[PDB]
């Protein structure tokens, strides 16, 4: 009754002993060819042509395979109405404003706490 959900940023950097036991596989955009070859060999040769769409995947588009799904298919995950607190930083929009005072006293006080 104890299973795992492995969330990792590259398939070729986690140990195979944990990774091989994961029958259910969710694959998002993978620009590394070593990763796409790892997703290639997890598939049969008949459904081996869908992984060519891996580096072209948009945000929220995933490739799901395993005994849970009928066929390995590229799916669009439902948008999170209550999302995690991970918002991308608008670098151009932040840099366009003025120089900030940036409160150095509070940062290194909290840094020294940790």
């Amino acid at each position: 009754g104890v299973t795992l959900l492995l969330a990792s940023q590259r398939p070729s950097e986690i140990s195979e002993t944990i990774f091989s036991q994961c029958n259910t596989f969710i694959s998002m955009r993978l620009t590394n060819p070593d990763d796409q070859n790892y997703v290639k060999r997890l598939l049969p040769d008949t459904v081996g042509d869908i992984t060519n769409l891996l580096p072209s995947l948009k945000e929220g588009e995933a490739l799901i395979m395993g005994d849970s799904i009928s066929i390995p298919s590229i799916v669009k995950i439902e948008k999170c109405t209550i999302p995690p607190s991970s918002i991308d930083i608008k670098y151009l929009d932040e840099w366009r404003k003025e120089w900030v005072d940036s409160e150095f006293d509070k940062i290194i006080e909290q840094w020294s706490k940790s």
Binding site: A7, S8, M28, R29, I69
Partner: protein
């Protein structure tokens, strides 16, 4: 997939009107590995699957279902996705040191390797004895208490045990004699529980088996205890 075992959290990319359900039992009993580049929606998808598991309730009630999910969240992001959840940090979570079995008691506390056989022995014998002393159940369970038993022991009196045995003094009969408020006694299995306190004064003629050979052991052990 049958009607009851369907688990939907996504639709087909080419056809948004086509829903893609997976076998919810087979989705979770066999482990899930979700991978992708940075910004690909991996953390949002993990939260989305966890949310669909939480509201996966059979008809007949309103309260919480039987979902039990533990998140090792290293970016402080999943608190927002689950506002009705319990969030634990190191400053508040308490995982007791006496819940370790034999393997991680040596891994957390002992940094010596391959030449520490007397230091390993006084470590397990202090812990096993202290677990037996604080036990309050039936005596039949008391004697099966061993080194890996998840029972409470005081690591401060464990240090007191190795500190006392660091000053042990044997007599002419090669037996260790101690003195405390109760009186003189001999170090054996029925009296070694009196070494967990620091008001015990050794009495003897010659140095014991561990006299002076545990000073660096206590210093390394007290460093891990006092490490914040």
């Amino acid at each position: 997939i049958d009607i009851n075992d369907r688990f939907t959290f996504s639709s087909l990319s080419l056809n948004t009107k086509v829903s893609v359900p997976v076998n919810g039992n087979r989705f979770f009993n066999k482990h899930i590995a979700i991978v992708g580049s940075t910004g690909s929606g991996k953390s949002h998808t993990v939260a989305k699957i966890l949310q669909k598991a939480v509201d996966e309730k059979q008809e007949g009630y309103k309260g919480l279902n039987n979902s039990h999910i533990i998140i090792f969240d290293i970016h402080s992001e999943y608190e927002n996705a689950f506002p009705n959840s319990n969030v634990l940090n190191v400053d508040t979570l308490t995982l007791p040191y006496w819940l370790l079995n034999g393997d991680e008691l040596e891994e957390l506390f002992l940094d010596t390797e391959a030449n520490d056989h007397n230091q390993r022995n006084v470590f397990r014998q202090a812990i096993t004895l202290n677990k037996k002393i604080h036990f309050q159940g039936d005596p039949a369970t008391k004697e099966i208490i061993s080194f890996h038993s998840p029972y409470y022991f005081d690591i401060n009196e464990v240090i007191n045990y190795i500190n006392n045995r660091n000053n042990e003094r044997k007599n002419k009969d090669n037996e260790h004699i101690w003195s405390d408020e109760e009186g003189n006694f001999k170090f054996d299995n029925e009296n070694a529980h009196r070494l967990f306190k620091e008001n015990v004064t050794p009495d003897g003629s010659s140095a014991g088996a561990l006299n002076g050979k545990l000073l660096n052991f206590v210093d390394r052990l007290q460093s891990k205890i006092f490490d914040k």
